[PDB]
Amino acid sequence: TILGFTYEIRLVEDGKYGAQDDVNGQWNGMVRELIDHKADLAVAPLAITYVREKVIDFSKPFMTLGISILYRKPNGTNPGVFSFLNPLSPDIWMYVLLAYLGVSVVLFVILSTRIVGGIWWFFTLIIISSYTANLAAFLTVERMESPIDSADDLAKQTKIEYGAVEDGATMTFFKKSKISTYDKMWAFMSSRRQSVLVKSNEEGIQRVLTSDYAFLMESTTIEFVTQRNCNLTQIGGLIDSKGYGVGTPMGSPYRDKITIAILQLQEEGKLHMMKEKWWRGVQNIGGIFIVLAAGLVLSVFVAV
Amino acid sequence: LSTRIVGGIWWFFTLIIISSYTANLAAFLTVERMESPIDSADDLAKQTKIEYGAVEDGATMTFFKKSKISTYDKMWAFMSSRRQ
Amino acid sequence: VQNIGGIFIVLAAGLVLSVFVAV
Amino acid sequence: SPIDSADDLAKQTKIEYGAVEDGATMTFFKKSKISTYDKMWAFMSSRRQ
Ligand SMILES: C/C(=C/C=C/[C@@H](C)C(=O)O)[C@H]1CN[C@H](C(=O)O)[C@H]1CC(=O)O
Ligand SMILES: C/C(=C/C=C/[C@@H](C)C(=O)O)[C@H]1CN[C@H](C(=O)O)[C@H]1CC(=O)O
């Protein structure tokens, strides 16, 4: 509507983006389809990398983004309704019930009262001391466990599997990266090549749903997969800033008018409205209150 | 015996809520005392959670450019990779 | 168990001693 | 915990450590195949005075 050109959409024959093979230097995907002038405009969301900018021409990026880490929501901890069997296991509960039965059967025949009260005192103090120590240890081992906040915590671990789509920046960005943690990421990608280098974004989503997987993927599509699926989460900030631009052949005379039109659309903020249109659209303690209420209503029922 | 068991469950209730309070405070104090901040120059070059940079190009940046230590050189490469 | 069973054993021995006191 | 070997002081930083200025003790962390000895070299370079 802003330039008056008529256009026809044709699917590329291999269904993949612009990459190259190192065995011959031949590009394939978007770049090979664009150097031979088979198509002119590449509106498909390509990344503005370095070597793909060097080979073929890009417009100005109409929006920016980065790579980030997709993870399963760690919602495995929930007390729920009652469920106080898990803290202070019922072996201890039947032990103290047998102790209460023993003091109840001694209570019929009862200088004796002072020592019975004393042994009851330090028995209850030792029991409550052990329970407070165990609960404090349990809370400080639960609180010292944290989710993987960013890429450094994922670099510290190796048990949770991680990876990205095969080629297309990601690990080819990591081999063009001298950061030692990201060098360890690239060494992991080389060492664990044969399991997690899935090209499809569907199975890269699907491996997070089934397995304990982290998936390195585009920060824009985080919004789409979190609007669709509410069981997923984003961890980490933004690694490095990239963008989505328009792919043109080298020396295309239309490209200057295309980026002037992109800046004209961004002058009024035209992109944001259809971006939002297409892209948006203590209980562990609570049981003892019920226990005290049941005991109070039992005392009320036996009092009358 | 009814007043005795009401007093017993009252002492038990305040006992268990102070027990949970002590466990919560002990966990909070243990996490706070085991938490340590960053002070060394290697404590920023080790992870990517903290980003950093110099004022501009010049004596700050050319010292890390000439870093043969491979400790300032690693953070130099990190800040060089995302100079924008 | 372990510590708790030993505390139970000590409690039973003290109960036996209190019965011996009560005679 | 008390100190047990060089890997425990490799991650440690509150206890400073060093060696002779010029000698053969330098060349263990000048050339090494373990990154912990590189961390001790970083410890020497940060505390060269
Ligand atoms: C998921 C993906 C895979 C690319 C794979 C390689 C082998 C390719 O065909 O260039 C694409 C999606 N669009 C991205 C882009 O080009 O911006 C690219 C991945 C990426 O570069 O972040
Ligand atoms: C035992 C020893 C002691 C230190 C000597 C220094 C203080 C000196 O007089 O230069 C020597 C042995 N040869 C080493 C050297 O090559 O200087 C040095 C030990 C070392 O510092 O590695």
UniProtKB/Swiss-Prot annotation, chain A:
Where, by residue number, does the polypeptide cross the bilayer? Answer: 91-110, 119-139, 285-304
Family membership:
Belongs to the glutamate-gated ion channel (TC 1.A.10.1) family. GRIK2 subfamily.
- Give the free-text miscellaneous remark of the entry: The postsynaptic actions of Glu are mediated by a variety of receptors that are named according to their selective agonists. This receptor binds domoate > kainate > quisqualate > glutamate. It does not bind AMPA without coexpression with GRIK5.
Q: What does this protein do?
A: Ionotropic glutamate receptor that functions as a cation-permeable ligand-gated ion channel, gated by L-glutamate and the glutamatergic agonist kainic acid. L-glutamate acts as an excitatory neurotransmitter at many synapses in the central nervous system. Binding of the excitatory neurotransmitter L-glutamate induces a conformation change, leading to the opening of the cation channel, and thereby converts the chemical signal to an electrical impulse. The receptor then desensitizes rapidly and enters a transient inactive state, characterized by the presence of bound agonist.
Coiled-coil region: none
Name-wise, this protein is Glutamate receptor ionotropic, kainate 2
Instruction: Give me the Extracellular side stretches, as residue ranges.
Output: 140-284
Gene name linked to the record: Grik2
Question: What does the PTM comment of the record read?
Answer: Sumoylation mediates kainate receptor-mediated endocytosis and regulates synaptic transmission. Sumoylation is enhanced by PIAS3 and desumoylated by SENP1. Ubiquitinated. Ubiquitination regulates the GRIK2 levels at the synapse by leading kainate receptor degradation through proteasome.
Intracellular or extracellular location(s): Cell membrane; Postsynaptic cell membrane
Tissue specificity as recorded in UniProt? Highest expression is found in the olfactory lobe, piriform cortex, dentate gyrus, hippocampus, granular cell layer of the cerebellum, and in caudate-putamen.
Subunit record text: Homotetramer and heterotetramer with GRIK5. Tetramers may be formed by the dimerization of dimers. Assembles into a kainate-gated homomeric channel that does not bind AMPA. Can form functional heteromeric receptors with GRIK4 and GRIK5. Can form functional heteromeric receptors with GRIK3. Interacts with DLG4. Interacts with NETO2. Interacts (via C-terminus) with KLHL17 (via kelch repeats); the interaction targets GRIK2 for degradation via ubiquitin-proteasome pathway.
Glycosylation: which residues?
Answer: 75, 231
Residues the record lists as binding L-glutamate = 45, 47, 52, 169-170, 218
From Swiss-Prot, chain B:
Subcellular localization(s) per the UniProt record: Cell membrane; Postsynaptic cell membrane
The coiled-coil regions, if any, are: none
Which miscellaneous remark does the UniProt record hold?
The postsynaptic actions of Glu are mediated by a variety of receptors that are named according to their selective agonists. This receptor binds domoate > kainate > quisqualate > glutamate. It does not bind AMPA without coexpression with GRIK5.
Q: Which parts pass through the membrane? A: 9-29
Highest taxon of the lineage: Eukaryota
Summarize the PTM comment: Sumoylation mediates kainate receptor-mediated endocytosis and regulates synaptic transmission. Sumoylation is enhanced by PIAS3 and desumoylated by SENP1. Ubiquitinated. Ubiquitination regulates the GRIK2 levels at the synapse by leading kainate receptor degradation through proteasome.
Q: Which residues of the full protein are shown?
A: 631 to 714 of 908
Positions of L-glutamate binding:
59-60
Q: In which tissues is it expressed?
A: Highest expression is found in the olfactory lobe, piriform cortex, dentate gyrus, hippocampus, granular cell layer of the cerebellum, and in caudate-putamen.
Q: Which organism is it from?
A: Rattus norvegicus (Rat)
Q: Please give the name of this protein.
A: Glutamate receptor ionotropic, kainate 2
Functionally, this protein is described as follows:
Ionotropic glutamate receptor that functions as a cation-permeable ligand-gated ion channel, gated by L-glutamate and the glutamatergic agonist kainic acid. L-glutamate acts as an excitatory neurotransmitter at many synapses in the central nervous system. Binding of the excitatory neurotransmitter L-glutamate induces a conformation change, leading to the opening of the cation channel, and thereby converts the chemical signal to an electrical impulse. The receptor then desensitizes rapidly and enters a transient inactive state, characterized by the presence of bound agonist. Independent of its ionotropic glutamate receptor activity, acts as a thermoreceptor conferring sensitivity to cold temperatures. Functions in dorsal root ganglion neurons.
Describe the family membership recorded for this protein in Swiss-Prot or TrEMBL. Answer: Belongs to the glutamate-gated ion channel (TC 1.A.10.1) family. GRIK2 subfamily.
Subunit comment: Homotetramer and heterotetramer with GRIK5. Tetramers may be formed by the dimerization of dimers. Assembles into a kainate-gated homomeric channel that does not bind AMPA. Can form functional heteromeric receptors with GRIK4 and GRIK5. Can form functional heteromeric receptors with GRIK3. Interacts with DLG4. Interacts with NETO2. Interacts (via C-terminus) with KLHL17 (via kelch repeats); the interaction targets GRIK2 for degradation via ubiquitin-proteasome pathway.
